[PDB]
A paper describes a structure:
Crescentin is a coiled coil protein that is required for the crescent cell shape of bacteria such as Caulobacter crescentus. This revealed the full-length structure of the parallel coiled coil dimer of crescentin and how dimers come together laterally and longitudinally, to form a non-polar, octameric filament.
Among the MBs, megabody 13 (MB13), a derivative of nanobody 13 (NB13) binds to both CreSwt and CreSsat at pH 8. When looking at the map down this twofold axis, each strand consists of four partial CreS dimers (dimers A, B, C, and D for strand I, and symmetry-related dimers A’, B’, C’, and D’ for strand II) within a viewing window of ~960-Å wide along the filament. The resulting atomic models of CreSsat and NB13 allowed for interpretation of CreSwt maps, determined at lower resolutions (4.36 Å to 5.78 Å).
Residue numbers in the entry:
A (entry chain G), B (entry chain H): 154 to 216
C (entry chain M): 297 to 356
D (entry chain N): 288 to 356
The structure:
Amino acid sequence: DLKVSSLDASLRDATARIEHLVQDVEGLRVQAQDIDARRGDAEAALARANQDNALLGEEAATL
Amino acid sequence: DLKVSSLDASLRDATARIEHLVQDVEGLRVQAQDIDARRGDAEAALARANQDNALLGEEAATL
Amino acid sequence: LEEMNGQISARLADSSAQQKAVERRAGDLNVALERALDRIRALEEEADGLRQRHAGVDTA
Amino acid sequence: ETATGRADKLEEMNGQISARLADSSAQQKAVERRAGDLNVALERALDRIRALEEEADGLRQRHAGVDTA
């Protein structure tokens, strides 16, 4: 009866961490793509002005 | 002993499944942070260029 | 000068990136306590039934 | 000439908003201390959780033996 008892520990526990860390898994998953919202427009912003500094360089030519 | 058997299923149900999601999670945690630092190099690079924008700018103003 | 432009960038690169990191780990560390904190007393509360079921039997 | 002007502007903002960076980093350091205390609490809570596991083990043995009795 010790056997049934003592071995009852992890199964409840491991599920808990299964219940615990998986929730974190999808939780910290979308965390990555959340940044992707900030990345793309910035990527445009980088693209928006990287070409324009030479355009500024080109405006600098108007000198 | 049925329980001594029916306990075994979960201990392999969980551990393997908990042997599953983990190595993903830090691996997933590793990649995006590896991604994110790259973001700061270029995102800020826009600013320092725009810092150089004013350079040509106050050059575009003086002289 | 530009070196401090390097340096202010060096801080800008340092401060913002460590800023981009510190809370993100802290946030994980932020959410961390409660789940421990819950199971800190969750096991404690179920520890009562371990103590609860014991006593009467020893009386018996 | 242009070096003089563009610099002067450069040192000025570099100074003030660099100190700004220092200050914002300082609040970030306060967050760092919070996170570290959170962390050490996490390990100590986990150790208490383990000790709870063995203690409940013991409770189970002192349940079972007296059941036998």
